[PDB]
Ligand binder design. Structure first.
Ligand SMILES: COC(=O)Nc1nc2ccc(C(=O)c3cccs3)cc2[nH]1
Ligand SMILES: N[C@@H](CCC(=O)N[C@@H](CS)C(=O)NCC(=O)O)C(=O)O
Ligand SMILES: [Mg+2]
Lengths: 198, 198
């Protein structure tokens, strides 16, 4: 069908969907809105958030709902129902952490202490948990790449913006990042995508 | 299989899983820990968070991952692939909002202010969106109950504790909570569960 993704000009919460479409070699309109048009566009949305994915003018919302929809019956899904549960669980564990950040914070000091707090104390613990979880396997779940690996590469890319040294002690999480980045369709997208901070 | 759910003595993030087992008429061990015992259990969990659900000796984590797993191939999941997406989206929409609250905040003057801002400035927008979303239909998605309906009733029960007037302008939302609460297996669980604030 006809796919149109609407988001800001950032990776943010649309990037997992952009990776999936890249990987499945599915063409879509990557619509990136002007911030000035935001109040308008927002009053057409089911819940006032983006991203939304229009599928033949049937609207889907909630980036991970959409991601799960798109990967259903693909090799990105997890190879069994329980492995699908582990893929969902890892994704939510990463999302829970990312959602802790006051991304829409006003007081640029209060923001920067919340950030410093989360990055100084919370992120290292998560990195260590993820490194133990991964251990010596190739991918986070099962014997092949799933969208949870994509989500790790996406989340950690943003986290490295604010904390460059995040993985100095975790070469195996770096390896996994570079393996996702090396999958040809993902590599092409990374090279083609707009360069944005977030 | 043999199921063991581990959580605090609280509805909280385990409640959605408890509703699903009640509705599907599935026996499980409802293991409620007290605080004394939490640090020692924590250190054995790969992500240090509960709920967990042990299934024939394998551990699953992340409450919505687990709920989605348990409902796969039941009437609770949604019928079409698109309806499954909408179920996941509504669940995520409710959960994202439940996530803004500083549940852990120990300085209660800052806690109480935050709760109040959220409940006054934010919540009513979401209620309005959910009510418009529901329209005149019996259930959120499709024409039969799904776990999104259960998560609505659960999330709103907790919200109503802090903002008792939350649904005063939303009779269609109150009707939906009452329908979920009238489903006999759910009714019986609500009657019998331990009474806890949250
Ligand atoms: C003294 O206990 C707490 O404040 N902690 C606490 N932890 C909690 C975790 C979850 C919830 C809760 O009601 C939901 C969150 C998402 C859906 S229901 C409420 C909670 N309250
Ligand atoms: N998104 C997760 C939240 C898990 C979570 O943060 N659980 C809390 C209590 S609801 C917890 O284990 N906190 C205790 C701790 O972190 O030590 C889920 O739904 O399972
Ligand atoms: Mg979430």
């Amino acid at each position: 069908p006809n796919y149109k993704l609407t988001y800001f000009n950032m990776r943010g919460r649309a990037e997992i969907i952009r990776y999936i479409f890249a990987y499945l070699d599915i063409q879509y309109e990557d619509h990136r809105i002007e911030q000035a048009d935001w109040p308008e566009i927002k009053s057409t949305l089911p819940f006032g958030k983006i991203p939304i994915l229009e599928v033949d003018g049937l609207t889907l919302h909630q980036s991970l709902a959409i991601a799960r929809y798109l990967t259903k019956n693909t090799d990105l899904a997890g190879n069994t129902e329980m492995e699908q549960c582990h893929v969902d669980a890892i994704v939510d564990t990463l999302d829970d952490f990312m959602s802790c950040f006051p991304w829409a914070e006003k007081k640029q000091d209060v923001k920067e202490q919340m950030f410093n707090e989360l990055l100084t104390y919370n992120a290292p613990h998560l990195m260590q948990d993820l490194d133990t979880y991964l251990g010596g396997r190739e991918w986070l779940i099962g014997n092949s790449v799933t969208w949870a690996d994509f989500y790790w590469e996406i989340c950690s890319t943003t986290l490295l913006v604010f904390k460059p040294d995040l993985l100095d002690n975790h070469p195996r999480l770096v390896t996994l990042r570079k393996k996702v980045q090396a999958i040809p369709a993902i590599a092409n997208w990374i090279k083609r995508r707009p360069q944005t901070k977030l």
